[PDB]
Amino acid sequence: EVRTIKVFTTVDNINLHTQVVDMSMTYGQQFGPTYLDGADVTKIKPHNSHEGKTFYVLPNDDTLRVEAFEYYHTTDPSFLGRYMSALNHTKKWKYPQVNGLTSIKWADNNCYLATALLTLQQIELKFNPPALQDAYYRARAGEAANFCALILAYCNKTVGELGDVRETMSYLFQHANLDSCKRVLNVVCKTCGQQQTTLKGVEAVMYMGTLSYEQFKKGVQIPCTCGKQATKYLVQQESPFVMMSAPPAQYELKHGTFTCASEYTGNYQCGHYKHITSKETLYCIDGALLTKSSEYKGPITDVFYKENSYTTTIK
Ligand SMILES: [Cl-]
Ligand SMILES: [Cl-]
Ligand SMILES: [Zn+2]
Secondary structure, eight states, X not given: OOOEEEEEEESSSSSOEEEEEETTSOHHHHHSSEEETTEEOTTXXXXXXXXXXXXXXXXXXXXXXXXXXXXXXXXXXXXXXXXXXXXXXXXXXXXXXXXXXXXXXXXXXXXXXXXXXXXXXXXXXXXXXHHHHHHHHHHHHTOOHHHHHHHHHHTTOOTTOOOOHHHHHHHHHHTBOOTTOEEEEEEEETTTEEEEEEEETHHHHEEEXXXXXXXXXXXXXXXXXXXXXXXXXXXXXESSXXXXXXXXXXXXXXXXXXXXXXXXXXXXXXXXXEEEEESSXXXXXETTEEEEESEEEEEEEEEEEEOSEEEOOOO
C-alpha cells in the first residue's frame, strides 16, 4: 500500500513548492538534505503530522538557486545547511529586552553576537539581502533567532565558536547599504611628504588601530616604507556612524562622547564580550545582565560614534 502526504519545500520560507512525498522513503531519498524549522529530517520518514508543513531543502534546481540568491545574496553551497544548523540552537536562546533593546541571554559563547545585535539597534544601517532585512525587523521586535542564525551562517561561525565583534560587524556591513559613506585620510612622513587616500563603503566607516575618534582627527603614528613613523589623520568623513577598533586595552569611556562600545576580557582562545551604551548614564549590558555607572574603564575593543559630516581644520 503506497501512502503519500502533501508537503511544501522552500529555500526562503516565502516561495513554497508543492511536493507529494512517499511515506515509505526518507526526506533525504526524495529531496536531499531536508530541515523542519532547523531540525535535520534527512534520515526521517514522513509522519502524518507533517502534512501541509514547510521544509527547507538545498537549492537543487535553477528555480531554487535563483530564489536562494535573491533572498540571501550568497551562492555558498553549504549556506542553508549552516543556517539551519545554527537555527536549531538559536531558536532555544532567550532574547530579553534590556534597557529597551533586544539582547541575548548568554549561551554557547554568544556574547559577541549579543554586543553586535545591541550595537546594530543604536546605529543607522539598512541591510541589502531580504533575509537580513526580514530577520532584523523580527529581532528588533524581540524574536532574534533567525537573525542570529543568519549572522552565524554569513560569518562562517558555528554555535559555540569564539567570534570577534570587529570581524562580525565587517560581514554585516558588507551586506548593508553603505555606498554613500566616504572617508579622506592624509598620511604625512617628514621624509616622504604627504599622500591623501579616499575610502568608500565599509572601509569608510571602520578603522583598526585606535579607539579614539578625536585621536584619529588629530593624527595616529603608522609605519612608512622609508622606516620612519608617519602621521595619518582624518581629512573628511561622510557617514552616519564610525567604528574605531583596537586590540583590547584598558580604556576610559566618558558619558556623552560615544554611542556604544564592546569590552573583551580574556585571551586569543577564550574570553567574554560585554556591551557599554551611553544614554542618560553608562549602561553595561552583558547578555541578560544590566549594571550602570557614571564612569567606565575596561579592556575596550570597539567604539561607535555618531557622525554626519566632518571636515578637518588641519592644513
Ligand atoms: Cl523557496
Ligand atoms: Cl534592514
Ligand atoms: Zn617615509
